[PDB]
Amino acid sequence: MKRTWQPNRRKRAKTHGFRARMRTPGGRKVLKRRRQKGRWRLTPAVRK
Amino acid sequence: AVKKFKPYTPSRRFMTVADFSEITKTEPEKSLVKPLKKTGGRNNQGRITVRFRGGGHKRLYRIIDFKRWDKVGIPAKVAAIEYDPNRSARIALLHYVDGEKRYIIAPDGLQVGQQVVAGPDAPIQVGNALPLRFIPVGTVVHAVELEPKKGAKLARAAGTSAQIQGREGDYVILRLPSGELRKVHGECYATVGAVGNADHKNIVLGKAGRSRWLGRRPHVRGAAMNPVDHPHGGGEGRAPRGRPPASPWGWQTKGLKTRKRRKPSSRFIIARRKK
RNA sequence: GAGCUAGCCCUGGCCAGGGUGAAGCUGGGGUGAGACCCAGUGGAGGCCCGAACCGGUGGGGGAUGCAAACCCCUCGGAUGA
RNA sequence: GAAUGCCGGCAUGAGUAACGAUAAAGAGGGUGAGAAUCCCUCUCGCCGUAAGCCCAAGGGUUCCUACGCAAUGGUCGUCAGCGUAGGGUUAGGCGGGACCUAAGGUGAAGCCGAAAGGCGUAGCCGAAGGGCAGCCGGUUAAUAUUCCGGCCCUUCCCGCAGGUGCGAUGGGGGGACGCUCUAGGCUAGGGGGACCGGAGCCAUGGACGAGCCCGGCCAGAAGCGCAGGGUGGGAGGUAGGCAAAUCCGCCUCCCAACAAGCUCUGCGUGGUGGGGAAGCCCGGGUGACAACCCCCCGAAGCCAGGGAGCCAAGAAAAGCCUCUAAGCACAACCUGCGGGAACCCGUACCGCAAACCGACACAGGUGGGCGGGUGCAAGAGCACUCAGGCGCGCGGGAGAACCCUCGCCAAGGAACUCUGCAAGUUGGCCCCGUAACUUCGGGAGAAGGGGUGCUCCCUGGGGUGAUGAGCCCCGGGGAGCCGCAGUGAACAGGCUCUGGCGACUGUUUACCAAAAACACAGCUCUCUGCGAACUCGUAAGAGGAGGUAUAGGGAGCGACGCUUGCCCGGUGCCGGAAGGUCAAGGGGAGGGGUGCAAGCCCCGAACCGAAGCCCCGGUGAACGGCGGCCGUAACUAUAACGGUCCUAAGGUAGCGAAAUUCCUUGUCGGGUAAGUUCCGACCUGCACGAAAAGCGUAACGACCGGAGCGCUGUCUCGGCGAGGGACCCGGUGAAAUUGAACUGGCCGUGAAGAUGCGGCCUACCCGUGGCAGGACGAAAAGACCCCGUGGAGCUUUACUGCAGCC
RNA sequence: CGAUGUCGGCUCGUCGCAUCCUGGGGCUGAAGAAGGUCCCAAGGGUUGGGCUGUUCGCCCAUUAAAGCGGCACGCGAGCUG
RNA sequence: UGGGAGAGGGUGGUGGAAUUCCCGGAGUAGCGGUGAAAUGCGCAGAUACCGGGAGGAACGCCGAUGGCGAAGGCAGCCACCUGGUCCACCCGUGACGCUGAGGCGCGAAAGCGUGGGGAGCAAACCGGAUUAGAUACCCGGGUAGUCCACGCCCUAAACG
RNA sequence: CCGAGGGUAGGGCCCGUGACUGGGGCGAAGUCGUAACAAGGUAGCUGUACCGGAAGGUGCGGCUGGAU
RNA sequence: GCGGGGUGGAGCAGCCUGGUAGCUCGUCGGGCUCAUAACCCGAAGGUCGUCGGUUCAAAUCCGGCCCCCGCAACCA
Ligand SMILES: CO/C(CO[C@H]1O[C@H](C)[C@@H](OC)[C@H](OC)[C@@H]1O)=C1\O[C@H](Oc2ccc(/C=C(\C)C(=O)N[C@H]3[C@@H](O)[C@H](n4cnc5c(N(C)C)ncnc54)O[C@@H]3CO)cc2)[C@@H](O)[C@@H]1O
Ligand SMILES: *C(=O)[C@H](CCSC)NC=O
Ligand SMILES: [K+]
Ligand SMILES: [Mg+2]
Ligand SMILES: [Mg+2]
Ligand SMILES: [Mg+2]
Ligand SMILES: [Mg+2]
Ligand SMILES: [Mg+2]
Ligand SMILES: [Mg+2]
Ligand SMILES: [Mg+2]
Ligand SMILES: [Mg+2]
Ligand SMILES: [Mg+2]
Ligand SMILES: [Mg+2]
Ligand SMILES: [Mg+2]
Ligand SMILES: [Mg+2]
Ligand SMILES: [Mg+2]
Ligand SMILES: [Mg+2]
Ligand SMILES: [Mg+2]
Ligand SMILES: [Mg+2]
Ligand SMILES: [Mg+2]
Ligand SMILES: [Mg+2]
Ligand SMILES: [Mg+2]
Ligand SMILES: [Mg+2]
Ligand SMILES: [Mg+2]
Ligand SMILES: [Mg+2]
Ligand SMILES: [Mg+2]
Ligand SMILES: [Mg+2]
Ligand SMILES: [Mg+2]
Ligand SMILES: [Mg+2]
Ligand SMILES: [Mg+2]
Ligand SMILES: [Mg+2]
Ligand SMILES: [Mg+2]
Ligand SMILES: [Mg+2]
Ligand SMILES: [Mg+2]
Ligand SMILES: [Mg+2]
Ligand SMILES: [Mg+2]
Ligand SMILES: [Mg+2]
Ligand SMILES: [Mg+2]
Ligand SMILES: [Mg+2]
Ligand SMILES: [Mg+2]
Ligand SMILES: [Mg+2]
Ligand SMILES: [Mg+2]
Ligand SMILES: [Mg+2]
Ligand SMILES: [Mg+2]
Ligand SMILES: [Mg+2]
Ligand SMILES: [Mg+2]
Ligand SMILES: [Mg+2]
Ligand SMILES: [Mg+2]
Ligand SMILES: [Mg+2]
Ligand SMILES: [Mg+2]
Ligand SMILES: [Mg+2]
Ligand SMILES: [Mg+2]
Ligand SMILES: [Mg+2]
Ligand SMILES: [Mg+2]
Ligand SMILES: [Mg+2]
Ligand SMILES: [Mg+2]
Ligand SMILES: [Mg+2]
Ligand SMILES: [Mg+2]
Ligand SMILES: [Mg+2]
Ligand SMILES: [Mg+2]
Ligand SMILES: [Mg+2]
Ligand SMILES: [Mg+2]
Ligand SMILES: [Mg+2]
Ligand SMILES: [Mg+2]
Ligand SMILES: [Mg+2]
Ligand SMILES: [Mg+2]
Ligand SMILES: [Mg+2]
Ligand SMILES: [Mg+2]
Ligand SMILES: [Mg+2]
Ligand SMILES: [Mg+2]
Ligand SMILES: [Mg+2]
Ligand SMILES: [Mg+2]
Ligand SMILES: [Mg+2]
Ligand SMILES: [Mg+2]
Ligand SMILES: [Mg+2]
Ligand SMILES: [Mg+2]
Ligand SMILES: [Mg+2]
Ligand SMILES: [Mg+2]
Ligand SMILES: [Mg+2]
Ligand SMILES: [Mg+2]
Ligand SMILES: [Mg+2]
Ligand SMILES: [Mg+2]
Ligand SMILES: [Mg+2]
Ligand SMILES: [Mg+2]
Ligand SMILES: [Mg+2]
Ligand SMILES: [Mg+2]
Ligand SMILES: [Mg+2]
Ligand SMILES: [Mg+2]
Ligand SMILES: [Mg+2]
Ligand SMILES: [Mg+2]
Ligand SMILES: [Mg+2]
Ligand SMILES: [Mg+2]
Ligand SMILES: [Mg+2]
Ligand SMILES: [Mg+2]
Ligand SMILES: [Mg+2]
Ligand SMILES: [Mg+2]
Ligand SMILES: [Mg+2]
Ligand SMILES: [Mg+2]
Ligand SMILES: [Mg+2]
Ligand SMILES: [Mg+2]
Ligand SMILES: [Mg+2]
Ligand SMILES: [Mg+2]
Ligand SMILES: [Mg+2]
Ligand SMILES: [Mg+2]
Ligand SMILES: [Mg+2]
Ligand SMILES: [Mg+2]
Ligand SMILES: [Mg+2]
Ligand SMILES: [Mg+2]
Ligand SMILES: [Mg+2]
Ligand SMILES: [Mg+2]
Ligand SMILES: [Mg+2]
Ligand SMILES: [Mg+2]
Ligand SMILES: [Mg+2]
Ligand SMILES: [Mg+2]
Ligand SMILES: [Mg+2]
Ligand SMILES: [Mg+2]
Ligand SMILES: [Mg+2]
Ligand SMILES: [Mg+2]
Ligand SMILES: [Mg+2]
Ligand SMILES: [Mg+2]
Ligand SMILES: [Mg+2]
Ligand SMILES: [Mg+2]
Ligand SMILES: [Mg+2]
Ligand SMILES: [Mg+2]
Ligand SMILES: [Mg+2]
Ligand SMILES: [Mg+2]
Ligand SMILES: [Mg+2]
Ligand SMILES: [Mg+2]
Ligand SMILES: [Mg+2]
C-alpha cells in the first residue's frame, strides 16, 4: 500500500533545512546541540 | 418568480432556482472586479473559527459603492442589472454621465435605462440616495448608513428594507428589517426602495450538493458526537439533551441573550426586535 | 512532526463507450384570449449500464504471508457532496 | 544457577518448511577448470490500454567497455543492477534561473506581547499557472531538439536609413479565464487499392495469377491557397480613470454594421534537405536511380480568446499596445537592414520498477502523454495478434493420502445449513410484450418471450465524390444450406411476492462493524442592529464578512404526506427602577492602647450601599412529566355511568406481543405435510406515543426478516478427472520452542485429571509417510473477576480552584 | 488467573446399563390377539423432515424401536461460529 | 345617435371615529366583571383624565320597506380601468330567435398550500363560577382563523 | 401453411369464502344523561371547522321553517 | 433484599409527637314533589389485619405472623 515515507527534495529542505532551523529558537538549539554532540551533518542531506 | 423542475431525479423533484429574469448582463464589469480570497473559515492563525465552511464555487468579488455621497448631484443611468454571487441582492451597473462606472445593489422595481442620483435635493424615487433627514417619513428605504460617512450597513439583503417612522433632533427613527425600532443619525445616507430579488427566500436547495456549491460544508449535530467534543456528546443509544441545550463551548443556546448590556448604542435602540 | 492520515487554501490534470430523453424552442391543434394537448427539435440530471479511476459487499485463500491488511472470485460509485 | 535478567557464542527443531505468482519449456552449437541457469541459432509459450514506448517525481553512476567470481543473487554462474579499472552526460531556441504573479511565506511603515516572540499595508519571495525564440535527419560502445547537416527564429549592444513628440515603476486597454453540449474546416492516426517500386517464391492435390509476400513517406522560410480567431472608422464635447493625457470612460453627430479591410494563428502547398521495407548475404551491405500515387475512416488533438445553453456566476501579475508627467527634443523611441554579443544549473542511466516508497532483486503502492490490427452493436471492454518486450534467478522425477484452484456427474433438486453460505441458473444486441402501486418522473432490463450463423437473388436511404463509378455507413424483402448447438470462442443481470429500518445520491470505525449509524435538502426554537453575535488569540490581530436580519451563529428534528395533545409546582432561559439578603467602600453611636499634654494608634453599632440569590410573573419543536382504589347495565360477562383519594398535570390522535412484550412459542387467522421465525389481526402496552417527533409513504438499499419460481455437488452421497503443492533425487536451507530425558497402558495414589509414585499389564533396536486424543502442547507475566488508600478518559445539583462572563 | 478456549452443530467414536427395539423369562384383573408389570440380557440396532443458535421440546411422515447417561455438560494444535 | 341612476367588478391611493399596546404627565386604592361572585388586574402605582407614538381591522350619521348584480354577493372617500342596464329618437340589419344534454367559467362561510400580516374578535385550550355532573350556557384569559397576495377547495336553509 | 387443443407466463371481470373490523336495521317493560318539539328553559336549523362518554358544544357565515 | 401500606359499607385523615378516632360518599329516619332524583333537617355505623410485648394507659412505640402495593435481582 501507500507507505509513509514519500520523498520530496523541496519538502525536505524547506522543513528540516539549515535556514528553517535558523529561523526559530528551537531550531537554533537543535543546531547547537548537534554541533555540541559533534554530528557530522547538522541537517538532513538533500540534493537541491 | 422562482423556477421549478419536474421530478426526473430525486433531488430535482424539490429543487427551485431563481428565475434570473431581471438580469440583463452576464459577465461582470472587469475594472470593478477583484479576486475574492476564500478562507474556509480559517483565521490568520490558520485555525477554523467558523465551522463547516469551504469548497464552494470560485467567485470574483464585485466592488460595491456603499457610499453614494461620493458623487452628489452627478446623475447616472442604469446600464444593466447583473448577478452577484457574493450577496443575495442583485446588482445594478451605473454609467454615470461623469464617465464613471459603478455598482450598487439593485433596489426592487429599478429599471435599466433610468436615471438615478444622490444628494440632499434628489427626487424621492426608487434608486436615489439622500441623507435620511431629507427623506419623507413613511418611506421604505434600503442600504442605510448606520453612522455618517461610514457606509451602508443596514438593509442590504434581498428583499429587505427599512422604514422611516419619525424624527427626533439630529436623528431619525427607523424600523429595521428585524423589527427593531432604532434611532439613526439624519445625516446617514440611504437609498429609497426595497432591495430587489424578494423571491430569494423561496428558493429550495433541493439536495445536499447544492449546499456544497454554496461553500456550506456538512453541519454535524452535537447529539451525534462524544463528550470530548460536545455537551450533547455520548449517551448509550440516542439521548435527549439531558441538560440545558448548549453550544459546543458550553453556553446555553435556547434564549440566553448575548448582547453586551453596557454597549453605548443601547441609548439609540428604542425597541428590541419583532418576532 | 500534516513527505502517513483528516480538513481547508492556491494552481493544474482526469472520467472509454453506450442508454434514458427534463425545460426550452418550432410547428400543428385548442381558445375571446389562455391554460393545455400532439409532433419534431432539443440535450437537462448528486439520471441508467459499464472500463479507466475511486472503493471494499459476500465468500474462498493466505496466517514463521508475496504482504506487520496481500491475492482470487464477486460486489458499490463512476458529471459528482 | 535461576531475575520471560544483560552481552556474546553455540545448540534443538532438521537435512525439516521454504527457494516469493501454474505465462512453459525443448534441442543444437559456442565459451570455460566447472554450465539446466552465460552467449548464439531454431522450435515452443506469455504480455500487447502492456508485461511495449515517452515524460515527471524519487534514486544517484546503477549507464558503456575491459578484466574478474570471495561475498551479494533465495540454486548454479563462465553471468549481473556485484568487485576493479577506463570511458560516458556538450543547448541563446528543451527544462529552471538572469521575467511575472497564486495560496502561502516574508515583511520598510505601523501595531502588540515578561523574554523568546506574535501580527502587519506596500514591497519582496513563492509555480506543473502566465509569458518566452527549433523542427527533420545523420552520428557514438555510451549524449544529442545539446554534436553534425539542411532549413529557420529570439533578445541584447552598436552602426546605417527612414519614420515619430520621444519619454513611466505612473493612467488605460489587453492579458483574463466556469460547467455541459456543440458547428464548420483541418491535422494525428488508421483501412483499402486491379495503381507505383521490390529480393524472391509456386511447395503437398490445385494455382504463373488482375497470385503470394514487402513497402508506397518526413521536414521545410517567403509567397500563394483553403479554414478560423481578433478588431469598426471619423468628428465635437467632457466635470470621471487620486498629477497630466491626443489615451480609456461617458454623451452627441456622420459613414460603414450578418460583410469588407487590417491583423493574428492552424492547415495545405512550397525553393531545399532527408528517409526508404521484405528478402538475401556478412549492427553493416544489398535490394534502390527504390516507389513515394489514388479512394475511404477520422479524432478527445488543431484553427481557439469559436458557438450555444445553464447557474453554482468561473485567479493575479508581467511581457504587449496606448496615454501623457517630469525631463529631453544633436536626444529618444518606432521600422527596416547589417555586424557584433548571447551567462549560470540540469541533460548519463532506472522510472508501474530488480535501480522510486514498502528492512528483501518483496504477487503491495506510484502522477502525465502515446498505446497499432481484426472481430464481437460501441469502447481504453473481450479474444487473438503487430512493433516491441518477456517465460517471472532452483531444478529433475514421481502420479499416494490430504490441501488449494479448476472440470464433469446418474436419480433427486435446498432434503444442506444459523442462512441457498458457496456454486449453479440468468447473461450482449434487435424485436414483441410488460402488473400492483405512484410523488405521474417512475416502478422497467419488471415479469415473459421470439430472433441471432452461412449462401444466392431482388431492393430502399445516407456520407464522400460530381448529381455518376469506387469506397464507407444505416437498413428492407424473397429463396436456400449446415450443425447438438449461429452474441457457436471470450467479455456481459437469475427472477417474483411480502415485511422492518432509513426518504433519496452520498459519509464512517486506515487494519474484525458500511449499518438501521453520520450527512442530507426541509422544518422549528434561539441568539445576533454590525467595532454583530460567536470562534482562535495574553495581546495586537484575525475568521464571521469586505457579509448586514430573505444575513450570520447555536441547538434539535431529518424528503414528502396527515399531524404534533395536557402540565410552568421543580431546573433552565426571559421579563420585573418594589421588597428581603448581600462584598469592598461610605458612615462613626460607642469603646480601647499609649502619652504630662496637644496628639499618635487600634476596634467599632445604626444607616447609605452592585451583581447575585430570595421574591412576583412568563416560557415546551426549553430540562422534563403525563395516577390510584372501590362500585355500577333485566343471563353472564364487561362497564358508557358513579363514589373517593392524590397530583403541577394525569398519555390525546395515531400505533401496538413492536429493532419496544417480562410471563411468551400470548391467542386467533394465513402460508407449510409439519412454521419458537414470517405475514395479518386482537389488546392486561412487564416497559409505544407525538420534532431524543407519532403514524404513513412512490422511488431508492452490497442493510435485516419471511415465502415462492428457476437452477444447482449445498445435501441424499459420494465418484472421477486436471494443474500447483504434498512424496522421491540433486542444490540452497529457516522458525517459534527447548530444565534435562533412558518420555507406554490400566486401576489406584498424589496439591483433588501421573510417561516420571504403587500394584499389575504390555513392550526387540532405529526410522519414513500420515492423524491429531494427551504431553493440564505453543504463543501472550488473563482482556473477564478481585485486590492496589495504582493509573487514565468521561460525567455531575461531589469538593476546591481557574478561564470566561456579570 | 507468567491462560485448564466456552453453548450448540459437524465429524469420529467409545463406554455404562437404571433396556427404546430385537432374544429369553415369571406374574397378570393373561380367552385369543394385543397390553401391563417385573426379572435376565449391552450382541447388534436405535429413520428422514417443519420451527428455533439452541441443548431440550413441540409438530409432520414413518419405524422393530425412534433409549437415557459418562467420556474436561467427549471431541475448536479436527472443522464450524 | 343622444342621454340617466346605481354599495356592479378590478387596481392604486387616502380620511376620521374607536379598541389595544407603548412613552411621558398628573393622580390614589381600587379597577374589572356578574344573577350574585370568583378568577384576572392593581401601592412594583392599576382604574378614571390629558399630550404624544405605533398598528391592524371595520366604515358611524346619510341608510330607506332603498339601489346594483346572473347568482354568490357589493357600503368612508378619491382617481384610473371595466361589466351589466334603463329611457328617449324610430335612423341601420332583416328572423340574425328561444332554450340548452355535455363543455367551460363564476361560486358565502369554514377549510388547505406558500409568503406576509395580527389591533379587535375568537374554534381548540386553560382558568373562575353554576351544577348531581357541566368536557356547556355566564366570567377572565387564549392559539389557529378572522385580514393581504397568489394558488387550491366547490359546499349551504347557494331560499322566493 | 392453417389448425382442435395441450403447455409456459402475465393481465382483466365476476362469484363464493376469511381471523378480525365498520357502521346499519330490528328486538314489551336494561344503564347514563335530557339534544329537539313551549322562547323546550342557551330561539332553531344550517354548510364548515375544532372539541367532547353520549346526545351535543363552540367558532365563522348563512336561513326564518324564530317566538316577542 | 429494601421501602411503604392493612382503621365504620366504599375511598382517605389520625400514627411521626401514647390518653382525643376524623372528612367526603354511602346507609337508616323525617321533610319538599303528583312522584323520583337533586336539595334540606336528624341519626346510626369502626372498636383500628392477627397474636404477643412496653406501659397506669396503645390505632399510635417495639417483635412475630398473614396478606397488599412499589423497588431491586448486577459481572461473567
Ligand atoms: C475464556 O477465556 C479463556 C481462554 O481465552 C484464551 O482463548 C481465547 C479464545 C482468546 O480470545 C482471543 C484469549 O485471548 C485473550 C485466550 O487466548 C480462558 O478462561 C478459561 O477459563 C474459563 C473460564 C470461564 C469460561 C466460561 C464462561 C465465563 C461462561 O460464561 N460460560 C457460559 C457461556 O459460554 C454459556 N452461555 C451462557 N448463556 C448463554 C446463552 N444465552 C444467554 C442464550 N446462549 C449461549 N450460551 C450461553 O453458558 C456458559 C456457562 O453458563 C470458560 C473457560 C481459561 O482456562 C482459558 O484460558
Ligand atoms: C467473560 O466471559 C469474558 C468475556 C470478555 S468481555 C471483554 N471472558 C472471560 O474469560
Ligand atoms: K464483563
Ligand atoms: Mg520506514
Ligand atoms: Mg505525497
Ligand atoms: Mg521537489
Ligand atoms: Mg513541498
Ligand atoms: Mg529551509
Ligand atoms: Mg565531518
Ligand atoms: Mg550519523
Ligand atoms: Mg422542482
Ligand atoms: Mg434576477
Ligand atoms: Mg485586473
Ligand atoms: Mg496572514
Ligand atoms: Mg504562521
Ligand atoms: Mg463556529
Ligand atoms: Mg470551517
Ligand atoms: Mg447576486
Ligand atoms: Mg447613527
Ligand atoms: Mg432569487
Ligand atoms: Mg458559492
Ligand atoms: Mg446534521
Ligand atoms: Mg456541533
Ligand atoms: Mg452521540
Ligand atoms: Mg457516537
Ligand atoms: Mg480532541
Ligand atoms: Mg463536557
Ligand atoms: Mg447527553
Ligand atoms: Mg448517543
Ligand atoms: Mg435508550
Ligand atoms: Mg450513541
Ligand atoms: Mg430533549
Ligand atoms: Mg434527561
Ligand atoms: Mg458569551
Ligand atoms: Mg433588535
Ligand atoms: Mg512544526
Ligand atoms: Mg496532506
Ligand atoms: Mg504530501
Ligand atoms: Mg487517461
Ligand atoms: Mg428524442
Ligand atoms: Mg434553446
Ligand atoms: Mg450517475
Ligand atoms: Mg475484499
Ligand atoms: Mg460469493
Ligand atoms: Mg493478517
Ligand atoms: Mg486483491
Ligand atoms: Mg480480484
Ligand atoms: Mg475480479
Ligand atoms: Mg455505474
Ligand atoms: Mg467539483
Ligand atoms: Mg539462587
Ligand atoms: Mg527467552
Ligand atoms: Mg530481568
Ligand atoms: Mg539478553
Ligand atoms: Mg541448528
Ligand atoms: Mg542440525
Ligand atoms: Mg518434522
Ligand atoms: Mg521467485
Ligand atoms: Mg515463501
Ligand atoms: Mg550454469
Ligand atoms: Mg557451472
Ligand atoms: Mg530458466
Ligand atoms: Mg543467450
Ligand atoms: Mg491491442
Ligand atoms: Mg536508494
Ligand atoms: Mg560470486
Ligand atoms: Mg559462486
Ligand atoms: Mg577476487
Ligand atoms: Mg549469495
Ligand atoms: Mg532472494
Ligand atoms: Mg571462465
Ligand atoms: Mg543550439
Ligand atoms: Mg543579465
Ligand atoms: Mg515577483
Ligand atoms: Mg514558470
Ligand atoms: Mg489560469
Ligand atoms: Mg523556454
Ligand atoms: Mg510611430
Ligand atoms: Mg507618445
Ligand atoms: Mg507604460
Ligand atoms: Mg476577471
Ligand atoms: Mg451546470
Ligand atoms: Mg467538427
Ligand atoms: Mg503534418
Ligand atoms: Mg480503420
Ligand atoms: Mg481439382
Ligand atoms: Mg478629462
Ligand atoms: Mg535501407
Ligand atoms: Mg545504391
Ligand atoms: Mg466562447
Ligand atoms: Mg519641463
Ligand atoms: Mg551573471
Ligand atoms: Mg541527454
Ligand atoms: Mg525507460
Ligand atoms: Mg501494477
Ligand atoms: Mg504511468
Ligand atoms: Mg528494472
Ligand atoms: Mg525503499
Ligand atoms: Mg526474484
Ligand atoms: Mg515489486
Ligand atoms: Mg460489444
Ligand atoms: Mg517460469
Ligand atoms: Mg507476470
Ligand atoms: Mg447430478
Ligand atoms: Mg426442479
Ligand atoms: Mg429454506
Ligand atoms: Mg435466509
Ligand atoms: Mg450466493
Ligand atoms: Mg453461471
Ligand atoms: Mg455471458
Ligand atoms: Mg405511472
Ligand atoms: Mg416507464
Ligand atoms: Mg428480458
Ligand atoms: Mg458456418
Ligand atoms: Mg478469459
Ligand atoms: Mg448487467
Ligand atoms: Mg416484526
Ligand atoms: Mg442509515
Ligand atoms: Mg441510506
Ligand atoms: Mg422513518
Ligand atoms: Mg429524510
Ligand atoms: Mg435521509
Ligand atoms: Mg474497520
Ligand atoms: Mg478498528
Ligand atoms: Mg490502524
Ligand atoms: Mg472485513
Ligand atoms: Mg454500503
Ligand atoms: Mg421536514
Ligand atoms: Mg478563546
Ligand SMILES: [Mg+2]
Ligand atoms: Mg473581510
Ligand SMILES: [Mg+2]
Ligand atoms: Mg442559523
Ligand SMILES: [Mg+2]
Ligand atoms: Mg431543545
Ligand SMILES: [Mg+2]
Ligand atoms: Mg441525521
Ligand SMILES: [Mg+2]
Ligand atoms: Mg436523528
Ligand SMILES: [Mg+2]
Ligand atoms: Mg400519500
Ligand SMILES: [Mg+2]
Ligand atoms: Mg413545568
Ligand SMILES: [Mg+2]
Ligand atoms: Mg412558573
Ligand SMILES: [Mg+2]
Ligand atoms: Mg418554570
Ligand SMILES: [Mg+2]
Ligand atoms: Mg413604594
Ligand SMILES: [Mg+2]
Ligand atoms: Mg464598612
Ligand SMILES: [Mg+2]
Ligand atoms: Mg419534572
Ligand SMILES: [Mg+2]
Ligand atoms: Mg397548575
Ligand SMILES: [Mg+2]
Ligand atoms: Mg388530552
Ligand SMILES: [Mg+2]
Ligand atoms: Mg387530538
Ligand SMILES: [Mg+2]
Ligand atoms: Mg400487543
